[PDB]
Design a protein around this ligand. Structure first.
Ligand SMILES: O=P(O)(O[C@@H]1[C@@H](O)[C@H](O)[C@@H](CO)O[C@@H]1O)O[C@@H]1[C@@H](O)[C@H](O)[C@@H](CO)O[C@@H]1O
Length: 478
């Protein structure tokens, strides 16, 4: 009745510590090991999978007390996988200064600071009651707890081991418990029948790295895998021609992009970055490799932002005439520039890059592909152009414009983007004021500056496709 599931995946996270595993490949695993206080109802308000009403999970109930404080009443007798009961101390530790948003915490969870709300120290009222607090007002606390930043960790065990060692031997409250993790190869988790919620329906799940998508499709066809991830619309006809298999595709709240190491002199200033941005013919790429199913957004602007989504925003421009003009003004001598990609970790990463190489050749820029295997990533000093993605993880434009591209983020700090002062002042301003005409117009100014500066270039939202045996009725692939 309960089968062992074998999942062929595009990649394996570098760790299983829930925040440091935030990526396209970590959530599908950590989502089964850990739980959150609340969860989004993906089908609320008639939504076809992207609904936002919040429902109980580790917290049975919650009340916003004021514009800075939310009280959570926790479920009782919830057990971590090692048999330690979960209490308000564990939830307080999860969002503490020590673990997440303090100065020392940023050394081991490098992105904790940039992805945190403006937290103050949680208050434990009793064994099953915790108050999550912010130093300044924010309405996002509750939805933040349903996000990939809100997975609850065990205080005693986590603090003893440290963030890094915990990541190799994680302990959570989720429906599956950790078995093994082999870097760049597999993760195995097993049913936790002590789970507080619905009993797990699989006995074990193995996430196995299968780098090439054609090999994943072939493994599903042979019965080696029950489920496979990160396919494209082109694979659908063949898979659906098998009566015992099926595919599922949808536009994800994530965008593919290319970006630059702006510590490098060739990309320290905007002209050549913007030239490469203006030479990208996105409809051609979408028509050639995505069967016109991938979506091109009107800027760094997505419907899930709600009040900060601008449905009337103009399209991102394509101007080869201006791109040629900016290549010359930059003094670009013709030196080849590398573009690093971990194979097709991103669906259509290598075929899209080859099309963009030809587009860039037509504006006088020579770009060379540098394709590497998992774990063979280059040092920052050797990275020039690279591909990336950003999952739009909040119902507010704060994510990912401010958490990734703002003054506290990795694009400015690690990757050297010298953002104009107006950009960083606007990031600061929006994080103070509530939803209004002022906030809506400020995010539009940030979007305008993003396109002028080109620290990254948005390509499209992929039409994500996965496949599975029709007799596998539960697929832990998030
Ligand atoms: O798999 P990727 O695209 O990017 C991951 C990186 O996170 C990871 O460090 C790198 C090396 O292992 O491999 C991938 O490029 O995940 C991004 C996050 O990096 C990002 O924080 C989030 C929100 O913006 O969106 C996505 O989930």
């Amino acid at each position: 009745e309960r089968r062992a599931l074998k999942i062929g995946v595009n990649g394996i996270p570098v760790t299983l510590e829930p925040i440091n595993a935030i990526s396209n490949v970590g959530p599908r695993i950590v989502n089964q090991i850990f739980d959150t206080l609340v969860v989004r109802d993906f089908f609320s308000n008639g939504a076809p999978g992207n609904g936002i009403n919040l429902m109980p999970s580790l917290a049975e109930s919650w009340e916003r007390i004021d514009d800075k404080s939310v009280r959570f009443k926790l479920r009782q007798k919830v057990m971590f996988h090692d048999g330690v009961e979960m209490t308000a101390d564990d939830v307080a530790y999860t969002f503490s200064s020590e673990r997440l948003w303090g100065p020392d915490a940023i050394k081991v969870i490098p992105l904790g600071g940039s992805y945190a709300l403006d937290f103050d120290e949680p208050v434990v009222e009793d064994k099953y009651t915790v108050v999550i607090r912010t130093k300044t007002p924010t309405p996002l606390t509750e939805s933040y707890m349903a996000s990939w930043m809100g997975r609850i960790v065990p205080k005693a065990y986590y603090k003893t081991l440290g963030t890094a060692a915990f990541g190799n031997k994680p302990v959570g409250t989720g429906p599956y418990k950790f078995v093994e993790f082999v870097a760049n190869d597999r993760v195995v988790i097993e049913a936790n029948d002590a789970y507080w919620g619905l009993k797990p329906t699989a006995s074990k799940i193995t996430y196995q790295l299968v780098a090439e998508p054609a090999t994943r499709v072939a493994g599903l066809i042979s019965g080696e895998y029950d489920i496979v991830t990160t396919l494209t619309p082109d694979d659908m006809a063949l898979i659906n021609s098998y009566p015992d298999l099926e595919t599922r595709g949808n536009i994800v709240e994530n965008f593919h992009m290319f970006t630059f190491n702006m510590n490098q002199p060739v990309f320290q200033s905007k002209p050549l970055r913007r030239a490469l941005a203006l030479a990208v013919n996105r409809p051609l790429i979408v028509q050639s490799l995505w069967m016109n199913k991938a979506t091109i957004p009107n800027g760094f602007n997505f419907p899930n932002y709600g009040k900060t989504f601008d449905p009337n925003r103009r399209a991102m421009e394509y101007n080869i005439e201006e791109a040629k003009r900016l290549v010359k003004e930059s003094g670009y001598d013709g030196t080849p520039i590398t573009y690093h990609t971990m194979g097709n970790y991103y669906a259509n990463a290598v075929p899209a890059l080859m099309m963009m190489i030809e587009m860039w050749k037509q504006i006088g820029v020579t770009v060379v592909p540098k394709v590497y295997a998992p774990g063979g990533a280059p040092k920052d000093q050797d990275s020039y152009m690279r591909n990336w993605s950003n999952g739009q993880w909040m119902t507010d434009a704060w994510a990912t414009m401010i958490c990734e591209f703002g003054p506290k983020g990795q694009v400015q700090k690690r990757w050297g983007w010298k953002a104009p002062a107006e950009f960083n002042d606007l990031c600061t301003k929006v994080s103070q004021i509530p939803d209004s005409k002022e906030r809506f117009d400020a995010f539009n100014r940030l979007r305008d500056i993003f396109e002028e500066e080109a620290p990254a270039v948005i390509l499209y939202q992929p039409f994500d496709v996965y496949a599975a045996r029709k007799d596998v009725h539960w697929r832990p692939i998030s």
